[PDB]
């Protein structure tokens, strides 16, 4: 099979997403609240589903992507999951729990 | 065997998304799966092991959950409620 | 196994003429096959993954 490894208040925290192969811009993002369930907000990274705030944005191409928060808020505490899809199937990583 | 059911009323089940939450005591949020009625799209958890799968019956508006092999971690209370509109 | 031509076959028969074909002399990785969610229904009776 395919094995994947990832390394490693108000402080700068940056997380990264990795894939088995190059996935170009086929990325997914999740939003999680205290009592709530994760929901698909943006698919194909080019369509904004109605009702999703526009403050969420992404940049970068290739194999390196970065997530940055312009202004951390008490209501912005969340855990972000990264999902990728290709022509074969869907592979998930362990993720990071806060 | 033990079965848990959570059926809504007074609103269209197919027009309102339904999600399941698993949280045993002493742990955080561990999602397992969601279903899209339009195409039966199933999204799996990052720590999935193929333990349990979600299925729904459109004929009777009833959702069923079954375990392939019950273990210790399955003993937990689940959160069910009507979700966000569309 | 020749699953590519099975999944990409142009024409299929009716319900009363369901096709039965023997699968043998080939090796395939079913693990990746059932790891995906492409198939709406995947139910196994009498066996376990």
The residue ranges of every structural domain in chain A are: 4-98
End-to-end CA distance of chain B: 35
Chain B residues with CB inside 8 Å of A39's CB?
84
**CATH class of the domain comprising A4-98:** mainly beta
Measure Cα distances from B41 to A10, A11, A20, B33, B38 in Å.
37, 38, 23, 10, 8
User: Which chain B residue shows the shortest CA-CA distance from C41?
Assistant: B40
Resolution of the experimental model, in Å, one decimal? 2.8
User: Which chain C residue shows the shortest CA-CA distance from B33?
Assistant: C37
Q: C25 CB near a chain A CB, below 8 Å?
A: no
* Chains interfacing with B (3 or more CB pairs < 8 Å): A, C
Strands B16-18, B78-79: pairing is unpaired
Tokens of C43: 């139910």
Q: C38 CB near a chain B CB, below 8 Å?
A: no
Chain B residues with CB inside 8 Å of A94's CB?
46-47
Chain breaks in chain A (C to N over 2.5 A) after: 8
Report the residue from B34, B47, B79 with minimal CB separation from A94. Answer: B47
- Which residue, among A83, A89, A90, would best test binding to C if mutated, counting the most C CBs under 10 Å from its CB? A89
- Which residue, among A6, A17, A28, A37, would best test binding to B if mutated, counting the most B CBs under 10 Å from its CB? A37
Q: A90 CB near a chain C CB, below 8 Å?
A: yes
* Chains interfacing with C (3 or more CB pairs < 8 Å): A, B
- Long-range CB contacts (< 8 A, 24+ apart) of B74-79? B75/B24, B76/B22, B76/B23, B76/B24, B76/B25, B77/B23, B78/B4, B78/B6, B78/B20, B78/B21, B78/B22, B78/B23, B79/A35, B79/B20, B79/B21, B79/B23
Name the experiment that determined this structure.
cryo-EM
User: Which chain A residue shows the shortest CA-CA distance from B45?
Assistant: A92
Q: Nearest-CA neighbor of A68 among A14, A11, A9?
A: A14
Element (H or E) spanning A90, and its range?
strand A90-91
Chain C residues with CB inside 8 Å of A90's CB?
35-37
Q: Nearest-CA neighbor of A55 among A43, A44, A65, A41?
A: A41
Q: C49 CB near a chain B CB, below 8 Å?
A: yes
State the number of CA atoms in the 13 A half-sphere of B2 facing the CB.
7
Strand segments (E) across chain B = 16-18, 21-22, 33-36, 41-44, 52-57, 62-67, 78-79, 82-85
């Amino acid at each position: 099979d395919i094995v994947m490894t990832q390394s490693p208040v108000g402080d700068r925290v940056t997380i990264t997403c990795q894939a088995s192969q190059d996935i170009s811009n086929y990325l997914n993002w999740y939003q999680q609240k205290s009592g709530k369930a994760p929901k698909l907000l943006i698919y194909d990274a080019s369509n904004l589903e109605t009702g999703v705030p526009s403050r969420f944005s992404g940049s970068g191409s290739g194999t390196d992507f970065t997530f940055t928060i312009s202004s951390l808020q008490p209501e912005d505490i969340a855990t972000y999951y990264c999902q990728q899809y290709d022509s074969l199937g869907f592979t998930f990583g362990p993720g990071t729990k806060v | 065997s033990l079965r848990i059911s959570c059926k809504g009323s007074g609103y269209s089940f197919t027009n309102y998304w339904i999600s399941w939450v698993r949280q045993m005591p002493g742990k955080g949020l561990e999602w397992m799966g969601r279903i899209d009625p339009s195409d039966s799209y199933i999204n799996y958890s990052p720590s999935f092991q193929g333990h349990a799968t979600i299925s729904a019956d459109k004929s009777i508006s009833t959702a069923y959950l079954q375990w392939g092999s019950l273990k210790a971690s399955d003993t937990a209370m689940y959160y069910c409620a009507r979700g966000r509109n569309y | 196994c020749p699953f590519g031509e099975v999944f990409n076959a142009t024409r299929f028969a009716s319900v009363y003429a369901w096709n039965r074909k023997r699968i043998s002399n080939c090796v395939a990785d079913y693990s990746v096959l059932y790891n995906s969610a492409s198939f709406s229904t995947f139910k196994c009776y009498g066996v376990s993954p």
